[PDB]
PDB file of C-alpha atoms and ligand atoms in Angstrom:
ATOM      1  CA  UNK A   1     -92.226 153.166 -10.608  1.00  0.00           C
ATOM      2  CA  UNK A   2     -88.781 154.520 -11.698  1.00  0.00           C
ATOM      3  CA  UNK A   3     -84.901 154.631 -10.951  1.00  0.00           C
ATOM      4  CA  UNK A   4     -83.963 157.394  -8.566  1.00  0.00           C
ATOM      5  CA  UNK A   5     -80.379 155.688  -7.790  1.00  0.00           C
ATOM      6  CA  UNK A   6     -77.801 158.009  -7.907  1.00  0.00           C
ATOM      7  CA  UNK A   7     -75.990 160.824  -6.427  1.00  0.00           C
ATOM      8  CA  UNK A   8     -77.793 164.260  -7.047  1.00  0.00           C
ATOM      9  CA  UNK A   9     -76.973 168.244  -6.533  1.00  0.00           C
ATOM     10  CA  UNK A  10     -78.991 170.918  -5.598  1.00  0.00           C
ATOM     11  CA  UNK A  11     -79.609 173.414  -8.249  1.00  0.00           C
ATOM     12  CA  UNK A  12     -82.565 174.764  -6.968  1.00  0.00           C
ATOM     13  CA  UNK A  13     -84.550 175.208  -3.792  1.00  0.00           C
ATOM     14  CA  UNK A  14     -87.610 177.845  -3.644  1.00  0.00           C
ATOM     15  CA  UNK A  15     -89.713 178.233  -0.469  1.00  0.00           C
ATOM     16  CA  UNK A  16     -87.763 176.317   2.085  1.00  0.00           C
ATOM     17  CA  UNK A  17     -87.943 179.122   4.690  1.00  0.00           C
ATOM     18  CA  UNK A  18     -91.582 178.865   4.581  1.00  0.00           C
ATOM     19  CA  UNK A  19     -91.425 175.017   4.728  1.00  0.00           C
ATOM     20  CA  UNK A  20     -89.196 175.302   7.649  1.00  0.00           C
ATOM     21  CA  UNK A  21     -91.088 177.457   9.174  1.00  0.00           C
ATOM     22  CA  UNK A  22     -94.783 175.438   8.755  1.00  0.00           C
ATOM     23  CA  UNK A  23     -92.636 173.061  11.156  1.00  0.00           C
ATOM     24  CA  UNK A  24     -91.519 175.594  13.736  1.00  0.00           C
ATOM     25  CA  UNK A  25     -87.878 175.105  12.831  1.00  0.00           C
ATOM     26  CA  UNK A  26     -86.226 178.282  14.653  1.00  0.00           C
ATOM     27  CA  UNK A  27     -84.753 181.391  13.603  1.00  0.00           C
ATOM     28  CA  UNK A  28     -80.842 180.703  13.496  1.00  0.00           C
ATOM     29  CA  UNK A  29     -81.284 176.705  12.397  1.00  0.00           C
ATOM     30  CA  UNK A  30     -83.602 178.411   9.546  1.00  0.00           C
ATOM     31  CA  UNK A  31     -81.261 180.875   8.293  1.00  0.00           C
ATOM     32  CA  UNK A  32     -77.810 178.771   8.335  1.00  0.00           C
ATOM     33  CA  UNK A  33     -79.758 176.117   6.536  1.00  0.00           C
ATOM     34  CA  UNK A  34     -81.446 178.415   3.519  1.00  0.00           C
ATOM     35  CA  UNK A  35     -77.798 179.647   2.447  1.00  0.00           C
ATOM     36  CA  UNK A  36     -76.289 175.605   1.873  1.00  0.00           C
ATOM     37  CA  UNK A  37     -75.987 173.147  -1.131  1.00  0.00           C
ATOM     38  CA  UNK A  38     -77.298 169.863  -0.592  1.00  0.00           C
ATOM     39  CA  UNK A  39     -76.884 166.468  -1.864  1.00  0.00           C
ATOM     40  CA  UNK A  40     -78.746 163.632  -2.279  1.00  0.00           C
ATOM     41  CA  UNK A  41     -77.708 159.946  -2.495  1.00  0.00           C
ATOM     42  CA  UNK A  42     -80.341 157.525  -2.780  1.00  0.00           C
ATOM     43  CA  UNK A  43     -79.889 153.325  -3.470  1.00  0.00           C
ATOM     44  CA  UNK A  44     -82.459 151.733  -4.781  1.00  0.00           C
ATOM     45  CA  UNK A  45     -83.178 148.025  -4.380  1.00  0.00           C
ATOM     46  CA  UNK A  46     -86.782 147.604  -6.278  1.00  0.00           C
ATOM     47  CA  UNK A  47     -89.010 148.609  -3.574  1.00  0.00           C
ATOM     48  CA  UNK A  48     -86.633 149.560  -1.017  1.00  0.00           C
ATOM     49  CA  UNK A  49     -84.999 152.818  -0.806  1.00  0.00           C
ATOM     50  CA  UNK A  50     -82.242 154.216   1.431  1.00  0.00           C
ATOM     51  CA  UNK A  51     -81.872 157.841   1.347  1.00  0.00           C
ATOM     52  CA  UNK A  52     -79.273 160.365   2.675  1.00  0.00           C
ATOM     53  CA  UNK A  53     -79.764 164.145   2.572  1.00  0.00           C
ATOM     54  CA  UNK A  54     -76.081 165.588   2.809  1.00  0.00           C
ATOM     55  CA  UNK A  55     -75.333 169.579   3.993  1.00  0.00           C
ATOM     56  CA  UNK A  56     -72.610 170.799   5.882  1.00  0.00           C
ATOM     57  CA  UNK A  57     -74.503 171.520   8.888  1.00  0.00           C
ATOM     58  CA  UNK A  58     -76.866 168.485   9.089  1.00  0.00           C
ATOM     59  CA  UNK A  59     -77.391 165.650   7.303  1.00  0.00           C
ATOM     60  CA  UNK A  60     -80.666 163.585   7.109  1.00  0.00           C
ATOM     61  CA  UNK A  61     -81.202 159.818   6.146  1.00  0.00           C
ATOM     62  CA  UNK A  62     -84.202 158.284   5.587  1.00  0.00           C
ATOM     63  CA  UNK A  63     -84.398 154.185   4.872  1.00  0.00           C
ATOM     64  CA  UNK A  64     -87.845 152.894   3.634  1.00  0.00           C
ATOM     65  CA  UNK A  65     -90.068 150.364   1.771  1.00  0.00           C
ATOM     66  CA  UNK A  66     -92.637 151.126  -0.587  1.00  0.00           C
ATOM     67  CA  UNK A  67     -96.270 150.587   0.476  1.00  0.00           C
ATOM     68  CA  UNK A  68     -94.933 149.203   3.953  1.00  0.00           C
ATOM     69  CA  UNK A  69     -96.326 152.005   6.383  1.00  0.00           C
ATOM     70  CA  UNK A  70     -93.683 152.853   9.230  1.00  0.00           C
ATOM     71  CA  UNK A  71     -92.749 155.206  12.309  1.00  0.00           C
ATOM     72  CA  UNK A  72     -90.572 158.103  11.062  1.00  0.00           C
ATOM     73  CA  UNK A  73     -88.934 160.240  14.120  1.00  0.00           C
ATOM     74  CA  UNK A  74     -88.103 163.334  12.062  1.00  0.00           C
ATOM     75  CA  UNK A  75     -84.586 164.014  14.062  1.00  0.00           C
ATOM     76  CA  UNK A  76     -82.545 167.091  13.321  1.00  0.00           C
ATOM     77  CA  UNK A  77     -85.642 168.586  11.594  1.00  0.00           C
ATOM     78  CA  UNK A  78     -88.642 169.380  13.857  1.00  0.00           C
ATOM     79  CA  UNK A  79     -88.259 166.088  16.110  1.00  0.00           C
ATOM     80  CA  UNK A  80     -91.579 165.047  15.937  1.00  0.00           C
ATOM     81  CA  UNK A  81     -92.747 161.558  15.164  1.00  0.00           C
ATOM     82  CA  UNK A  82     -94.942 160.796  12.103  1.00  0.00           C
ATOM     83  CA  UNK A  83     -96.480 157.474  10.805  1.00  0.00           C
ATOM     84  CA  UNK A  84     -95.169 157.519   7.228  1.00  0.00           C
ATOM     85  CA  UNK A  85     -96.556 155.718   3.984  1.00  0.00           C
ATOM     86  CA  UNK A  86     -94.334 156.195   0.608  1.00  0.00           C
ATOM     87  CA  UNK A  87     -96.620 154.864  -2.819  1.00  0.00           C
ATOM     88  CA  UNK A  88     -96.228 154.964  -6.645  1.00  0.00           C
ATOM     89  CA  UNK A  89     -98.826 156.871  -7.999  1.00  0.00           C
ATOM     90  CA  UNK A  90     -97.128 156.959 -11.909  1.00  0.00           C
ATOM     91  CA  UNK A  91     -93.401 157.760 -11.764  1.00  0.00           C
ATOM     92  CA  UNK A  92     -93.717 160.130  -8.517  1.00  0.00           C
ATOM     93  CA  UNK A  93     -92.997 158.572  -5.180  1.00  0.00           C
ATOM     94  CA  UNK A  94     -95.584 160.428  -3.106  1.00  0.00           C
ATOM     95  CA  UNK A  95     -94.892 160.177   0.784  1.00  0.00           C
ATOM     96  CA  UNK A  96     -97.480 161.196   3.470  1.00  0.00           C
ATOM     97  CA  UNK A  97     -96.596 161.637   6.783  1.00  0.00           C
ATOM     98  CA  UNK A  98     -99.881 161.570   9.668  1.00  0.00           C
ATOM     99  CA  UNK A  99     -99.480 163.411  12.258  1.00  0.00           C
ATOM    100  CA  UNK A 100    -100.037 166.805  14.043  1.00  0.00           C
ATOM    101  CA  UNK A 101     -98.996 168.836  10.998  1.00  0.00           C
ATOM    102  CA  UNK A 102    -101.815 169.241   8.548  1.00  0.00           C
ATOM    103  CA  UNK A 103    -100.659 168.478   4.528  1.00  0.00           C
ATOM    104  CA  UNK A 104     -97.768 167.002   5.651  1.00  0.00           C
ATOM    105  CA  UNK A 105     -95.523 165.063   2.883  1.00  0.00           C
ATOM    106  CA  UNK A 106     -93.219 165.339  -0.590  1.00  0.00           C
ATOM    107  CA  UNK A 107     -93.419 164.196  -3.786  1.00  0.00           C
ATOM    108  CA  UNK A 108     -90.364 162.990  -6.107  1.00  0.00           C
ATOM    109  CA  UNK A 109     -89.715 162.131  -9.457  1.00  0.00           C
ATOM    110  CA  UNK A 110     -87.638 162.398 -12.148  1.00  0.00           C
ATOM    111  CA  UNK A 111     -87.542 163.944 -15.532  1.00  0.00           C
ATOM    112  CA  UNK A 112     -84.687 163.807 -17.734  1.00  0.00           C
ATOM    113  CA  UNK A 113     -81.324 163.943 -15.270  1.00  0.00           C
ATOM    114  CA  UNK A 114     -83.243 166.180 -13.062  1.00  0.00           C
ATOM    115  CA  UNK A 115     -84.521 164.916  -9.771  1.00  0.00           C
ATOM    116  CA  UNK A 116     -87.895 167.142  -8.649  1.00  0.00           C
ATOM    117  CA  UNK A 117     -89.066 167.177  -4.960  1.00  0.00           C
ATOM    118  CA  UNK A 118     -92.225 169.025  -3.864  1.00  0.00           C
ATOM    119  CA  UNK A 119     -92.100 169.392   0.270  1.00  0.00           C
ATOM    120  CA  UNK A 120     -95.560 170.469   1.770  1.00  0.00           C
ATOM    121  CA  UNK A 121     -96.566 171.440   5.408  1.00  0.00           C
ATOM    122  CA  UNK A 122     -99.704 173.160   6.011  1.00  0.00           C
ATOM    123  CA  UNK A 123    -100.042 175.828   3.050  1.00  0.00           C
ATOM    124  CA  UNK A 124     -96.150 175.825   2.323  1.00  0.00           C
ATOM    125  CA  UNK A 125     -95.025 173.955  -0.236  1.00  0.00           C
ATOM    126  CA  UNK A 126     -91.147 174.099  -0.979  1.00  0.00           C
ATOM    127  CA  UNK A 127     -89.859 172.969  -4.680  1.00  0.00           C
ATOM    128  CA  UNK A 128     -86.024 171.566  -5.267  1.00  0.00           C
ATOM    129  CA  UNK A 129     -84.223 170.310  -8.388  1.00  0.00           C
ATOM    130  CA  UNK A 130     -81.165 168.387  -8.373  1.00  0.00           C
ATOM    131  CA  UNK A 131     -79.025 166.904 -11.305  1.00  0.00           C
ATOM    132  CA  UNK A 132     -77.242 163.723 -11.162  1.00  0.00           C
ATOM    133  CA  UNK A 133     -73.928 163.614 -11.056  1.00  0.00           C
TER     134      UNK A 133
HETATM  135  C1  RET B 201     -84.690 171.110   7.753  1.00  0.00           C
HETATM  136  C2  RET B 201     -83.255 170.646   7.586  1.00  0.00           C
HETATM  137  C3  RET B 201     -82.767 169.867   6.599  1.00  0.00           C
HETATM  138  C4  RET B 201     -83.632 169.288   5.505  1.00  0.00           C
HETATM  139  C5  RET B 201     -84.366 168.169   5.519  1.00  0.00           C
HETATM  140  C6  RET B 201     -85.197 167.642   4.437  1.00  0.00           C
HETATM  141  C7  RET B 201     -86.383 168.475   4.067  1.00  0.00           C
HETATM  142  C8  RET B 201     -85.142 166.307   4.190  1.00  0.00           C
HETATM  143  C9  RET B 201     -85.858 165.585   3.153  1.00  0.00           C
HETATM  144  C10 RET B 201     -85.853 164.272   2.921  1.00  0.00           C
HETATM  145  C11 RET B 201     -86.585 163.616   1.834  1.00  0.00           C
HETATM  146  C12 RET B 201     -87.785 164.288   1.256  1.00  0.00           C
HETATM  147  C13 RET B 201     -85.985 162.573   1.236  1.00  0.00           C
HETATM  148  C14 RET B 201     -86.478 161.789   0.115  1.00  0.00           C
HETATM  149  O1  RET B 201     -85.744 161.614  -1.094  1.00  0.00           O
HETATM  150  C15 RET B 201     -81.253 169.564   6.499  1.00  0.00           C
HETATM  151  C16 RET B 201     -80.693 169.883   5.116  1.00  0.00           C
HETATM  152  C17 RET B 201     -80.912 168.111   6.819  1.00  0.00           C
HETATM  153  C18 RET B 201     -80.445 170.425   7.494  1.00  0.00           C
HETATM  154  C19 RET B 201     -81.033 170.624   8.774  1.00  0.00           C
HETATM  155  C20 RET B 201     -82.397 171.223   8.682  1.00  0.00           C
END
């Protein structure tokens, strides 16, 4: 369990064509989105968490409750729809999401003023850092 409020900035993202491509995203979608910055604003309420993932291009929000399993429709990303479970297990806020994609999930936790996320899909796995702001 642990505070991920805050408003965070990419300063690293390795992989995330491969991730992108585990879900089929296509070939102009991919490259625009490997070149931007992102940001990440997340509120925390104890166990409930509402989460926006900022670009120019796209953005991505994501509202959930911890150990409550719901229906995620991944829009803007591959459109599928995934039955999604996000648990403590320590200080990392693991996230599986069942569905057609094998190994499907991320993991996120934070160490110092760094925020790490680990984004898997199939064999890909995708690693980002931000820093708060
Ligand atoms: C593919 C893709 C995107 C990335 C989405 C990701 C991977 C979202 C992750 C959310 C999580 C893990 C939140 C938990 O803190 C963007 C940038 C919206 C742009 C459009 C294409």
């Amino acid at each position: 369990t642990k505070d991920q409020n805050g408003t965070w900035e990419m300063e690293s993202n390795e992989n995330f064509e491969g991730y992108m491509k585990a879900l089929d995203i296509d070939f102009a979608t991919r490259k625009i989105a490997v070149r931007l910055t992102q940001t990440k604003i997340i509120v925390q309420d104890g166990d409930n968490f509402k989460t926006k993932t900022n670009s120019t291009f796209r953005n991505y929000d994501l509202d959930f409750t911890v150990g409550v399993e719901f229906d995620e429709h991944t829009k803007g990303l591959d459109g599928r729809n995934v039955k999604t479970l996000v648990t403590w297990e320590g200080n990392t806020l693991v996230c599986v999401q069942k569905g057609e994609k094998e190994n499907r999930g991320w993991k996120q936790w934070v160490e110092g003023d760094k925020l790490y996320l680990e984004l898997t899909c199939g064999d890909q796995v995708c690693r980002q850092v931000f820093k708060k702001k």
